[PDB]
Amino acid sequence: TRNGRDSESKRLGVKLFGGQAVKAGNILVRLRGTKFHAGYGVGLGKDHTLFAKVDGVVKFETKGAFGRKYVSIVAA
Amino acid sequence: ATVKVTLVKSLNGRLANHKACVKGLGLRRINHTVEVQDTPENRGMINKAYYLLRVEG
RNA sequence: AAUGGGUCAGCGACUUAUAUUCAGUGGCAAGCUUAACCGUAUAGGGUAGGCGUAGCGAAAGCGAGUCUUAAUAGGGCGUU
RNA sequence: ACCAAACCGAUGCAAACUCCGAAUACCCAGAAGUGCCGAGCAUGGGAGACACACGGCGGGUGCUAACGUCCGUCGUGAAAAGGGAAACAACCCAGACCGCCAGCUAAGGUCCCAAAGUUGUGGUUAAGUGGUAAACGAUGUGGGAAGGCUUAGACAGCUA
RNA sequence: GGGGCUCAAACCACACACCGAAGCUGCGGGUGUCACGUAAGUGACGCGGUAGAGGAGCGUUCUGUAAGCCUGUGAAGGUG
RNA sequence: UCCUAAAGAGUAACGGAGGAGUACGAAGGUGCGCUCAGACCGGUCGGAAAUCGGUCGCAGAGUAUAAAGGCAAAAGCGCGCUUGACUGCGAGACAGACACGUCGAGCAGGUACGAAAGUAGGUCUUAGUGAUCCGGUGGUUCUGUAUGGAAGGGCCAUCGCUCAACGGAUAAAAGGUACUCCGGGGAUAACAGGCUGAUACCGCCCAAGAGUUCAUAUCGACGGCGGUGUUUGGCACCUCGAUGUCGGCUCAUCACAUCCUGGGGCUGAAGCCGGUCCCAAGGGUAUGGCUGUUCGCCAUUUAAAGUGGUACGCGAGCUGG
RNA sequence: GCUUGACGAUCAUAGAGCGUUGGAACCACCUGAUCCCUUCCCGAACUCAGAAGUGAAACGACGCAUCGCCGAUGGUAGUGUGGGGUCUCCCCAUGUGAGAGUAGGUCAUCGUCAAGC
């Protein structure tokens, strides 16, 4: 019945938007279960964190079947 | 190729963006007139702060 | 229509000591500086000690390196 | 002759619904000019603050009550005088370096207190409405669209 | 807000003129910063402010300067 | 975990909803394989239902657990092997006051599976937790107060327990004050004032109805719109370097929503009476028994014993029940 | 220059449905399971050896817009900024601008390699 109780608001979402230069370890998307999928040179960590495996710029392409949003890094 | 603007209203309660536009045109106080080049990026600051200015040409 | 003061004239509130840090300003400079104390005594002497000239490591230690490490790999701190 | 999930069609609604989906704001890159000569960053020396208020907008709570209260975001006051709103932190205009018996303006104003139009053209309004206000009620009056009843003689009033 | 206002001194339009601020401009001063300048030397942008930071001064008493200088031809104080 | 949250983050309330203080040696790893659920129609124990044969199917199933977000390379499901639920680290980011926290390519050493590319530093993801100081235990290259050892200490790994007020005052922590005291505060309650009007009070709009007929002579259900600040509230704006209660007495003053007296209209007003509604504020408008009473109930009067505002008028005017 | 395979680009204007058509090469179905291998029980999947038959199933190509899915223009709602009002809401200037629906589309378009014509 009685009612308080929130939690500490985990700061999720898109870091490193769609034209930005990335280094080879940077967190792309903090994610709660794959909104965005792992593209060309990006990694998919344990808690579905997208991180960069190479350098370049972020792409954010909507590719393929299943309508999936991909974060990929184009070496440019 | 050159447009002249006159600041005819005050800055004293304006949004910080609009008064940044007026400052970026080179205007310092009321009835002050500059001659600025008519680049499209000067006309953006003229158009954002349109209500404070007097844009003759 | 909150406090305080009737008024005047006197008085009445960031000090001092010792350690230290930063700035400014001087002296000496890979060195600088003395404390007690001695002193015909603000001089001169007294360099014990303090800080600097090297760091790393919890330490032994090793040292322009050192620690961790199975590692001459990585990484931390350091080095005209 | 009771009652009937479900599908078919029509019809709505949500902060904890979404097949959709902005404006903005946010992040990055490249550019002109402006910056009061800087703005940003970094390292140090000294702080103060860590009870905010009200207004506009976007919300929760309340009774879409309170000069209630909790958030977001702008603005002002705090810590800002001046002019306007009669008087009136926070509303409008505008940010006071000093002097002037000079001028032009902003908000707001121009019959007299009181500075400036008893200004001009065309209207509306008779309540002192302006200069306090709701459901609803009124041949109040101005305007603009439309219907049929409209001289074979209509709408209320005299000679079967 | 009051007097008072009714072809308005109210309302809805439109026009032209005026008043109105410590706003702007003119004229005369002072100040900060920056850039220039054999350092006269001008320019340009500034200059509301509480807590608070920073900068530069006045005055009082004492000591040195000072066995100086002033002062009974008149000190300090007091009052114009 | 969702909303509030304003389409990046973040964001409050004694705001709205739910959860956690764990499980698991497989519910982990890997290789290989496989899709769920639902209607249908099928009566000789179940009859809508179990076991299957799936035609349509068309993610609605499942996921250890709340919610949200994700899942075909399924992250769901089955089987075979198995320990990577490794050691040393760690480029670089996310988060962020700090302490904490989150993700992680790659390199070395050794291993799982797989023919091999490769995957594997636990689990679909985010909760499942606790600092330091004390102690305990196992190592150790270190130290080891003359020396050789020990003792004790250090580093490395680990346990406790209790800090659930969960950034943890101490190993160890209940009350009374009307006998009270001090320092502050109108940062904050009681009185009265102030903002509001839920509530209260007074009017009005429609009129089902009753009034023997007839809605409007009188009421008037269901609903609606307001006025006044009249009183119970809500707020905490003034007052805590003091604005001293309720009632009575004494003295009042205004309003009008009029109790009497005055003037009317309608009537379901024959007349005496009335009912209701307008207009009117000039003057009047009880004494007592009870109780501290305001009020109230009675008794007896009057033409009538009005309703309210004034710090619920009035204690530098009295009383003090 | 087309047909059949394999692999991709792209994920419905590419789908689903309905109809016609394909066998010689290819692929599918097919024959049999001695032998590899397999069935929480399999030669119906997985696997091997095939070459008698069939294009029925499946798959492919061509048709059709009824279904699904795309989808204008215009308007409307929202909304940044500035100003108003009778301010729990709208209006004006200016910039922007949907979702839905309407007209209309769509029975895909590409590339590499290999056999055939």
Domains along chain A with CATH numbers = 13-74 (2.40.50.100)
What was the experiment behind these coordinates? cryo-EM
Work out if B1's Cβ lies within 7 angstroms of strand D.
no
Work out if A13's Cβ lies within 7 angstroms of strand D.
no
> Cα(B46)–Cα(B42) distance, rounded to whole angstroms?
6
Q: What is the 3-state secondary structure (H, E, C) of chain A?
A: CCCCCCCCCCCCEECCCCCCEECCCCEEEECCCCCEEECCCECCCCCCCEEECCCEEECCEEECHHHEEEECEECC
Query: If you compute the radius of gyration of chain A from its CA atoms, what whole number of angstroms results?
Result: 15
Tell me which DSSP letter residue B17 carries. Answer: H
Please give the C-alpha separations between residue B5 and each of A36, B19, B45, in angstroms, as whole numbers.
48, 14, 11
Report the footprint of strand E: residues with C-beta closer than 7 angstroms: B 10, 28-32
Report the footprint of strand G: residues with C-beta closer than 7 angstroms: A 62-65, 67; B 14-15, 18, 48, 51
Between the CA atoms of A44, A45, A51 and A52, what dihedral angle is there, to the nearest 10 degrees?
-70
Domains assigned to chain B: 1-57 (3.30.1390.20)
Protein-to-nucleotide distance from the CA of A22 to the C1' of C5, whole angstroms: 71
Resolution in A: 2.8
